Amino acid sequence: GFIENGWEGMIDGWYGFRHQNSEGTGQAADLKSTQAAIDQINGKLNRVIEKTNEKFHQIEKEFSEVEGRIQDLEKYVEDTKIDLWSYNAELLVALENQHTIDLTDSEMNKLFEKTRRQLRENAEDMGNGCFKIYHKCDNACIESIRNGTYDHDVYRDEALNNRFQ
Amino acid sequence: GFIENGWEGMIDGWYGFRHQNSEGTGQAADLKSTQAAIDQINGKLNRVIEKTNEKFHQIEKEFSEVEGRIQDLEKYVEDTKIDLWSYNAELLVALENQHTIDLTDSEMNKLFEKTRRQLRENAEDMGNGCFKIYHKCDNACIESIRNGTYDHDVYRDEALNNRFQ
Amino acid sequence: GFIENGWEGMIDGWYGFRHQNSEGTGQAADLKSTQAAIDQINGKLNRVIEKTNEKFHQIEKEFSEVEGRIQDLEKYVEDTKIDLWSYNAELLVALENQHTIDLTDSEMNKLFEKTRRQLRENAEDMGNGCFKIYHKCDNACIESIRNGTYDHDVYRDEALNNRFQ
Amino acid sequence: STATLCLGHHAVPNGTLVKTITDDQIEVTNATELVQSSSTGKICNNPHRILDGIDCTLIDALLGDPHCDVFQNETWDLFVERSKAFSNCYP
Amino acid sequence: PIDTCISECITPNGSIPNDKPFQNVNKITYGACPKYVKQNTLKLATGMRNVPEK
Ligand SMILES: *[C@@H]1O[C@H](CO)[C@@H](O[C@@H]2O[C@H](CO)[C@@H](O)[C@H](O)[C@H]2NC(C)=O)[C@H](O)[C@H]1NC(C)=O
Ligand SMILES: *[C@@H]1O[C@H](CO)[C@@H](O)[C@H](O)[C@H]1NC(C)=O
Ligand SMILES: *[C@@H]1O[C@H](CO)[C@@H](O)[C@H](O)[C@H]1NC(C)=O
Ligand SMILES: *[C@@H]1O[C@H](CO)[C@@H](O)[C@H](O)[C@H]1NC(C)=O
Ligand SMILES: *[C@@H]1O[C@H](CO)[C@@H](O)[C@H](O)[C@H]1NC(C)=O
């Protein structure tokens, strides 16, 4: 979406930060969002199809000779079951893939919004998914942003001065 | 999410406001969003499974003796139908619960955004789902916010002065 | 939602802009979002139900006389298949319609947010889905907004002066 | 000098654990049961014309077994056949 | 045993109410009955995500 590009250099996690300040460019991964998405994905098929059911004695499904009515009925029953289960599989896979994609997009958006809310007035969204912060933000500042304990109040004056002159 | 806590003291509705100003803390519920969610939930099963279908004469499903092919076929048909309907029930309940949860989250977010749009520049989102309004906002002001007729223009100067000094 | 009204005068696309500035009111459609939604909708049924399966020889489904067990079994099999397929059709149509509606709402919101991010500080969201831009924005400006190359930096000073006086 | 306005949603002390697409067990405020797993143990005699076959099988009532003489010309919407039915005529 | 009462759905286990769409009593049914499934319980959420205090 507004990220426009993935990071093949990101191997630490699924979603993460790339920061650039006076000290220098650094990169880290956000473990909580990646872990949440993986946890929500790790099952996703045992929660609907609990397991393989256990079938022991069934009808005959292959015939040598030609009987008539009963063989036709058996063939019809097997064909109906096969078609219905194929439709169930197709629909289930399509729905799960669509929901998984929407879920990961929502997780990315949630991480972006959480970061934006940490930087209340100290940063501006440049629109390409990357924040321009309007004050001195060192590596401790950046890891506090990543930590979730960024104190926006103590940079409010400097940030507002940088923004509105 | 960003609310981080529900209000067990809220019995008036599902979603509502808790305000604190000079006069004193007050609480009210937003009837429109709660009613919308309840209305969208009130059915939600008659709209897919219209009703119970009516079955009068069926096959035998319990057998005393052992016939052979035909009893095997009857057992197979009943087992196939039971398994398919169990899968349908499981998948339907899972999908409806997931969609209901997403729906209620979206309704909460919509109420929050509607309130934020009423308070154009007069308030700032503190990030914990709670607005700090930057002007005199009495109980009439608060009930106008809750009403949806909050006039942001007449507090714009005072709010901007409180914000940007 | 926050648009509150559709535009029957819009025939160019599904989602679009209506601008009003000093020159005069103009209207255009956004082709990318409309095309994306149409592309995602154009299939949406071949991707689950690939095609009509091909059935050649089946059981008898209409009977003249009364045989007994076997005719009862055939009637039961046909009735079970018909009921299951009716439920599959009903559920599929309901789910696809719900997801399509959510998809179009999300596309509208995405277009709105993209426009808002183009106008970083130069415009304010009036809350009815319509932006008040706080600087001279001529037809070239508007078509740059629609284009996606709106340069917010060169109007930043004038916009901030109009906003905060 | 400034006001404050928090937003929230109602909760409950105890919630019900349901199952979704992405969770085996997730807690919600309210939930309804969808599977009827209990029965009253008795057969309601309306709106369906029930015919309790006391000691009589369907074929025994059809043929005219003496202890089934009471079932002549009977009609039913559902014929309920008891396990205690027996034959007492020519084998 | 037969009873003097109103019910649209009859199983060998007796009459059952047909307000719910599924039942786990018996696969043998008569009337406007719910569908038989192998699961004894399926809870449908009729409320929001529950996040209590503390
Ligand atoms: C969850 O929803 C159900 C369905 O409305 C509620 O159960 C009903 O509550 C009303 C309230 O007066 C009673 O009259 C009904 O008899 C209840 N139905 C049953 C089957 O008991 C339930 O109270 C709701 N629970 C919560 C926590 O919201
Ligand atoms: C991050 O924050 C947590 C809790 O606020 C703290 O315990 C930790 O020391 C911080 N720094 C890290 C994890 O590097
Ligand atoms: C709320 O607004 C409506 C319409 O704007 C008005 O009729 C009503 O008097 C207001 N106050 C309330 C409902 O207390
Ligand atoms: C819109 O932008 C594109 C690429 O930035 C450019 O090629 C084009 O000339 C612009 N104007 C249009 C399409 O009217
Ligand atoms: C309600 O909550 C209490 C404690 O949280 C728990 O013990 C109980 O099982 C819950 N349900 C009812 C019906 O009391």
Author numbering:
A (entry chain B), B (entry chain D), C (entry chain F): 8 to 172
D (entry chain C): 9 to 99
E (entry chain C): 273 to 326
Provide text from the study.
HA is a transmembrane viral surface protein which is responsible for interacting with host cell receptors and mediating virus entry. Three HA1/HA2 heterodimers assemble to form a trimer spike protruding from the virus envelope, with the HA2 and the short N- and C-terminal fragments of HA1 forming membrane-proximal stem and the large middle fragment of HA1 forming the membrane-distal head. Triggered by the decrease in pH in late endosomes during virus entry, HA undergoes conformational changes that underlie its transition from a prefusion state to a postfusion state. Through initial biochemistry and cryo-EM data analyses, we found that F005-126, a neutralizing antibody targeting the HA head of H3N2 viruses, fulfills all our requirements.
We obtained three major conformations of the HA-Fab complex at pH 5.2 (HA-Fab-pH 5.2 conformations A, B and C) through 3D classifications and refinements. However, the HA-Fab-pH 5.2 conformations B and C showed significant differences in the stem region from those of the HA-Fab-pH 7.8 and the HA-Fab-pH 5.2 conformation A. The densities of the central helices in the HA-Fab-pH 5.2 conformation B are clearly visible, indicating that the central helix coiled coil is still stable and ordered in the structure. The densities of the fusion peptides in the HA-Fab-pH 5.2 conformation B are largely absent in the hydrophilic pockets of the central helices. These observations suggest that dropping the pH induced the release of the fusion peptides, which was also indicated by the aggregation of the particles. In addition, the densities of β Hairpins 1 and 2, the C-terminus of the HA2 stem and HA1-N become smeared in the HA-Fab-pH 5.2 conformation B, suggesting disorder in these regions. Rigid-body refinements of the structure segments in the stem region indicate no significant domain movements. The release of the fusion peptide can be further confirmed by a “zero out” map calculated between the map and the atomic model without the N-terminus of the fusion peptides (residues 1–20), which shows no obvious residue density in the fusion peptide binding pockets. The conformation B has the released fusion peptides while the other domains remain in similar conformation with the neutral pH structure. Of note, the conformation B in our research has not been reported.
